[PDB]
Amino acid sequence: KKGPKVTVKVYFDLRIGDEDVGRVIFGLFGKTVPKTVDNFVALATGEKGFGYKNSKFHRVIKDFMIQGGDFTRGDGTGGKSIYGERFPDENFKLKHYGPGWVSMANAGKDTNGSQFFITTVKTAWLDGKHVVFGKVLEGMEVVRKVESTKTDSRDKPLKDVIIADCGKIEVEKPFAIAKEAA
């Protein structure tokens, strides 16, 4: 079988409430969607200053997504990319294949921003309306633990999901990944 390549890695570190769980080593395609992958990478390094450092996971729905990210506000329509406020969707080349894929949460057509969502099951309801730009490659148990916290009526976790660290990990030779899950 066939699959896309990878170019860069990020080592997102979550902390549930007052506890630390692990290290979700990500994986980002850098030759199929060149732009959004630059958005995420440059934004996750604290380059300009609008970093993901000390962000909030607002929506945690039990079995569809774990989406959350905003440094301006804490849960609202807060968002600020580097290309302005709205960078056009570029190519819907891949489709969500089961657990553990990363795609951009838009608000319509040509209204992207900085709000990433990790999928937990196959989610074909949305397909071709959202651009996917990365696959996780480690630490599913961390997502499993962060997905099982007591939620509220408005999907906000009762406790807080603080992202306490990030950065860059480089790979010097693009390898390949499969196309089913994990």
């Binding site: 838009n106 969502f117 959202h130």
Partner: peptide
């Protein structure tokens, strides 16, 4: 329903 939007959250 099950959408992932930023601003007008729908059903």
């Amino acid at each position: 329903x099950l959408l992932v939007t930023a601003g007008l959250v729908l059903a």
